[PDB]
Amino acid sequence: MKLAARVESVSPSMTLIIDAKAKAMKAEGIDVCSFSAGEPDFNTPKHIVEAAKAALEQGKTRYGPAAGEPRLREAIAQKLQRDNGLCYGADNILVTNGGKQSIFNLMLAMIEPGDEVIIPAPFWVSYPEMVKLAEGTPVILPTTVETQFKVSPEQIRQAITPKTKLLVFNTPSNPTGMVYTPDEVRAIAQVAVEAGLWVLSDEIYEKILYDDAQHLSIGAASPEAYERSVVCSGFAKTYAMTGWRVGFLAGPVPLVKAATKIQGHSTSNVCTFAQYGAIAAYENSQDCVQEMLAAFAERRRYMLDALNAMPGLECPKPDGAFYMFPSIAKTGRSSLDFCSELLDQHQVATVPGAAFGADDCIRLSYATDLDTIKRGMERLEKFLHGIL
Amino acid sequence: MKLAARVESVSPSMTLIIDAKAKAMKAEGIDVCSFSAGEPDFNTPKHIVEAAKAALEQGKTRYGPAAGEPRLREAIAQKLQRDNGLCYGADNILVTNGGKQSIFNLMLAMIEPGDEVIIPAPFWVSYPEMVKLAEGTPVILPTTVETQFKVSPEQIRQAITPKTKLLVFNTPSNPTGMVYTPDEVRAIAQVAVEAGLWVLSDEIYEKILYDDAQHLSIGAASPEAYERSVVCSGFAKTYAMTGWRVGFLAGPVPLVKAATKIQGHSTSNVCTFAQYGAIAAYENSQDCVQEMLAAFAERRRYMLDALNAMPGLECPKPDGAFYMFPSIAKTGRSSLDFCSELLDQHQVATVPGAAFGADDCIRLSYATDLDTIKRGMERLEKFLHGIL
Numbered sequence: 001m002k003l004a005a006r007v008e009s010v011s012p013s014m015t016l017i018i019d020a021k022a023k024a025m026k027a028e029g030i031d032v033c034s035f036s037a038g039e040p041d042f043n044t045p046k047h048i049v050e051a052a053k054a055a056l057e058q059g060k061t062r063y064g065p066a067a068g069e070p071r072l073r074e075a076i077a078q079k080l081q082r083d084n085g086l087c088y089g090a091d092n093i094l095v096t097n098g099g100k101q102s103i104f105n106l107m108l109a110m111i112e113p114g115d116e117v118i119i120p121a122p123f124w125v126s127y128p129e130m131v132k133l134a135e136g137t138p139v140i141l142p143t144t145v146e147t148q149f150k151v152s153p154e155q156i157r158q159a160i161t162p163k164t165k166l167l168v169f170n171t172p173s174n175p176t177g178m179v180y181t182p183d184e185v186r187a188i189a190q191v192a193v194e195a196g197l198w199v200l201s202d203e204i205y206e207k208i209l210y211d212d213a214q215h216l217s218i219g220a221a222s223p224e225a226y227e228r229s230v231v232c233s234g235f236a237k238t239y240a241m242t243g244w245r246v247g248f249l250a251g252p253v254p255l256v257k258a259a260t261k262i263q264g265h266s267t268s269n270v271c272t273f274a275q276y277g278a279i280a281a282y283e284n285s286q287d288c289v290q291e292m293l294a295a296f297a298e299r300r301r302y303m304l305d306a307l308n309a310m311p312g313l314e315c316p317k318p319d320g321a322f323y324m325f326p327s328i329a330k331t332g333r334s335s336l337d338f339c340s341e342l343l344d345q346h347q348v349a350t351v352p353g354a355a356f357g358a359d360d361c362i363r364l365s366y367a368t369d370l371d372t373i374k375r376g377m378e379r380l381e382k383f384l385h386g387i388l
Numbered sequence: 389m390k391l392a393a394r395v396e397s398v399s400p401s402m403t404l405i406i407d408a409k410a411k412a413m414k415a416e417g418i419d420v421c422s423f424s425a426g427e428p429d430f431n432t433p434k435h436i437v438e439a440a441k442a443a444l445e446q447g448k449t450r451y452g453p454a455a456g457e458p459r460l461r462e463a464i465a466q467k468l469q470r471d472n473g474l475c476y477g478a479d480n481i482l483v484t485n486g487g488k489q490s491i492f493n494l495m496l497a498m499i500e501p502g503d504e505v506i507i508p509a510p511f512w513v514s515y516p517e518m519v520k521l522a523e524g525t526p527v528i529l530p531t532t533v534e535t536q537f538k539v540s541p542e543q544i545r546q547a548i549t550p551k552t553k554l555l556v557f558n559t560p561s562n563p564t565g566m567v568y569t570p571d572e573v574r575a576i577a578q579v580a581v582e583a584g585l586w587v588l589s590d591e592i593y594e595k596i597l598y599d600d601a602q603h604l605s606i607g608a609a610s611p612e613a614y615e616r617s618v619v620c621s622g623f624a625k626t627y628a629m630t631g632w633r634v635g636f637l638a639g640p641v642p643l644v645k646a647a648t649k650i651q652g653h654s655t656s657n658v659c660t661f662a663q664y665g666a667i668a669a670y671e672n673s674q675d676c677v678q679e680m681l682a683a684f685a686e687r688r689r690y691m692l693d694a695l696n697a698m699p700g701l702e703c704p705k706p707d708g709a710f711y712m713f714p715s716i717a718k719t720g721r722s723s724l725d726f727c728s729e730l731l732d733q734h735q736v737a738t739v740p741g742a743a744f745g746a747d748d749c750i751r752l753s754y755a756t757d758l759d760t761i762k763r764g765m766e767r768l769e770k771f772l773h774g775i776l
């Protein structure tokens with residue numbers, strides 16, 4: 001009657017109560033400004049939606065190879081060569097249910113009981129939980145607003161132990177929205193290569209960039225970095241396809257084949273017609289992406305300016321993704337208390353940094369309409385003035 | 389360099405050489421009579437496809453609850469009450485990527501290193517591999533043509549040890565097409581109940597029955613069995629939705645919640661619009677099912693008689709699914725050899741029984757048109773004659 005230890009070790013969500021309160025308030029018709037979303041507000045581009053409907057009509061509703069539709073594995077490989085300078089072939093990629101499964105399959109393929117996985121904080125909520133489902137030991141590397149929430153190569157080097165099996169490297173970042181410069185990624189890749197450790201490069205937000213920030217896949221830092229790294233990414237953020245559940249793992253054939261064995265004995269191939277939508281996302285014009293990015297840039301401008309004019313905060317300027325992760329340390333309140341109080345007092349929903357391993361910060365998403373942002377930021381400022 | 393022990397323990401497929409070759413042969417102009425498919429030939433019913441297209445058009449493309457869409461979880465619970473006499477509510481349901489992920493999540497939730505899992509042979513190929521991915525130890529129970537390829541409760545009792553944690557029970561069965569009668573299901577249920585052993589009830593083929601055979605969910609055998617059993621099923625076979633990847637886990641709330649946590653940290657929710665199609669499958673008329681079933685019953689009758697009139701083969705009568713699993717023992721050959729030459733020499737595709745733990749048999753699938761069946765059965769007879 002006892003559950004496996006691996007699942008018992010998974011931590012319960014820290015945002016259960018605040019999420020329920022927000023839900024209930026909305027059910028009552030209370031005017032809430034929400035900045036908790038972890039997905040774009042845009043609809044999936046029409047041509048991607050149409051491709052999927054066409055595949056459905058064409059009968060693309062049967063089983064397919066576990067590694068994914070050959071046409072999509074090819075499109076992905078070509079995209080990685082063209083955009084990221086990564087020399088991959090179709091044999092190097094595995095189609096998964098979102099970037100999440102890509103990461104999950106990598107963990108089960110590489111992490112054995114006892115292995116340590118270095119995870120810089122703040123971190124995407126699922127990272128340590130996934131490491132634990134694979135029976136590994138999460139090694140959290142804390143960062144500060146003073147360091148732009150970035151881990152240094154020396155910080156990584158110090159955390160390496162004979163048990164260290166993997167380094168999780170997410171840029172641009174959720175929840176900070178911070179972007180490691182190409183020189184910074186090259187410097188991090190250098191430490192990894194020297195210590196001979198594998199790197200999981202989570203590049204899901206690669207296209208959501210601002211102020212001419214530049215994205216460099218860590219695997220493109222050098223041929224040695226390429227040999228010990230895998231790309232975990234997908235179509236969710238670039239194309240507002242969060243609900244499609246289509247992503248991929250790209251790396252050395254040996255690893256990919258092992259990850260593919262796992263895919264075949266867990267979920268089998270990814271939804272066939274959903275894969276066709278992803279084919280269209282890469283095979284067609286990227287105009288939709290730039291149009292969406294432009295709206296984001298406009299929202300970012302507004303929220304950043306507002307946040308910068310508020311007392312009691314410290315927000316490092318983010319150049320990627322669609323999040324702001326300001327420090328609320330000056331308020332002397334923990335993230336749970338701060339966000340719960342802000343919601344109750346001013347009806348503004350934000351995510352406590354505690355969920356990402358940073359109790360003195362909060363996450364806001366500007367992936368919502370400008371009017372919600374303007375009104376919400378006004379309420380937030382008023383809240384800060386009332387508690388300092 | 390070194391992959392986790394869990395994935396290195398997963399055996400390589402010995403079927404993708406045929407099931408995939410027959411395809412390559414078909415695509416090359418060669419007239420192949422394929423009886424190797426593990427999915428129906430029928431297209432997904434129109435109303436289900438339309439329901440999915442409508443969802444896509446309506447923007448059901450965002451993240452959703454890890455447990456699945458509330459409407460689908462409710463439609464599933466109702467279906468289980470109405471069809472299988474199970475009293476599940478929505479809280480007992482977890483929407484997964486096919487019945488395969490339902491089984492996978494269950495394994496990860498309750499199977500730990502050292503745990504033993506009893507698996508009746510011939511078994512669905514993935515069962516032992518999934519047990520091993522959860523680091524468990526499979527305990528395979530051999531059956532013979534004499535026992536109609538069905539295990540007896542005494543055989544199960546004899547195999548139970550203090551390390552036994554689970555019994556995998558699949559009926560109707562893949563690859564045998566055999567159906568355990570309600571009395572047999574009740575008998576097996578009581579051995580499990582007496583031992584306080586949990587039962588994984590793989591009921592995916594529950595609707596595909598013949599000669600008025602009857603399907604009884606193990607959990608409906610008694611309140612005690614209902615307490616320690618779970619249903620792993622889906623829409624794949626009943627509605628020709630194999631490529632949709634929509635299935636479910638149904639069981640006690642505590643277990644379902646644990647499986648849901650794993651779902652949340654592995655793949656997240658199941659493709660949102662694909663789920664809306666599953667809703668249409670259960671909410672609408674079941675005429676599509678009876679029609680396909682009718683076409684299946686006609687093909688079965690023909691293949692069954694053709695097989696029964698073939699000396700050198702012994703095939704118990706299958707009353708479920710769309711498979712036949714005749715013994716080729718008389719030929720004194722291994723299924724790998726037999727199936728290999730049959731394809732090479734007569735362009736007839738069948739799956740080696742060795743894949744399912746029974747090298748002295750072969751699986752035939754009659755999920756194809758009648759003309760292909762009569763032609764293929766004539767080629768099979770000739771082949772047999774040549775080696776007997």
Ligand SMILES: *Cc1c(COP(=O)(O)O)cnc(C)c1O
Pocket residue numbers: 097098099100101124170173174202204233234235236242245246247655656
């Ligand atoms: C959203 C996200 C992912 C992947 O999500 P999918 O919907 O599974 O593709 C991976 N990493 C980070 C940091 C994310 O925010």
Ligand SMILES: *Cc1c(COP(=O)(O)O)cnc(C)c1O
Pocket residue numbers: 267268485486487488489512558561562590592621622623624625630633634635
């Ligand atoms: C087809 C099948 C399943 C379910 O597969 P999905 O497509 O993942 O739902 C489960 N068990 C058996 C024995 C099967 O043949």
